[PDB]
Amino acid sequence: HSQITLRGNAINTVGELPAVGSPAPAFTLTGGDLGVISSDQFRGKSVLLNIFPSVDTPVSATSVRTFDERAAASGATVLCVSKDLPFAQKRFCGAEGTENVMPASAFRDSFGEDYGVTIADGPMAGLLARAIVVIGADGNVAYTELVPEIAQEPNYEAALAALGA
């Protein structure tokens, strides 16, 4: 089980991110329209998981906008994964015009425990930590970042080099 900071104060996740080279855990998430978004849908393609506390937080929202702009440019598949309700993700994407990213919600699924990423303690317990996971066409993890501090933006450049690779 891992460790990050929220405003310089130490907090814990419930596990660890999947190891590079190993099989990315299977997932079934909830789409904006309450449909499913299964890992099986991305098999044989690369996908980046942009994992964060909430679209309704500022660094998280910025990451959605930045990945939407950058994906737009390249046809990259980016999944924006959080504990938001589907309705919040959808409302955000619709308010902002952010239409390359696919929002997906972990509100009724095991994603957060499975990816080691649920915050275990402090003010944000139950949300997902800020992390990036690149899953290759192969289904195995190509690259990961656990952002050290929650108020820090993800490393977009390293995540997307991994993804294009």
Rounded-to-integer distance, Cα 60 and Cα 46, Å = 22
Q: What is the dihedral of CA 81, 87, 88, 89, to 10 degrees?
A: 40
- Sign of the Cα torsion 26, 30, 31, 36 reads positive
149 binds a second copy (CB under 8 A): no
Rounded-to-integer distance, Cα 81 and Cα 50, Å = 6
Quick one: which of 13, 32, 57, 64 contacts a second copy (CB under 8 A)? Answer: 32
Quick one: which of 12, 15, 72, 109 contacts a second copy (CB under 8 A)? Answer: 15
Kindly state the smallest distance separating residue 162's Cβ from a second copy, in Å. Answer: 12
Quick one: which of 8, 33, 97, 157 contacts a second copy (CB under 8 A)? Answer: 33
154 binds a second copy (CB under 8 A): no
Kindly state the smallest distance separating residue 139's Cβ from a second copy, in Å. Answer: 10
Phi (first) and psi of residue 90, to 5 degrees: -65, -45
Q: Helices 156-164 and 58-74: crossing angle, nearest 10°?
A: 30
For residues 58 and 99, which CB has a smaller minimum distance to a second copy in the complex?
99
Kindly state the smallest distance separating residue 23's Cβ from a second copy, in Å. Answer: 4
148 binds a second copy (CB under 8 A): no
Q: What angle do CA 70, 107, 114 make, to 5 degrees?
A: 80
Where do contacts with a second copy occur on this chain (CB under 8 A)?
Answer: 15-26, 30-38, 40-45, 77, 102, 104, 114, 116, 141, 144
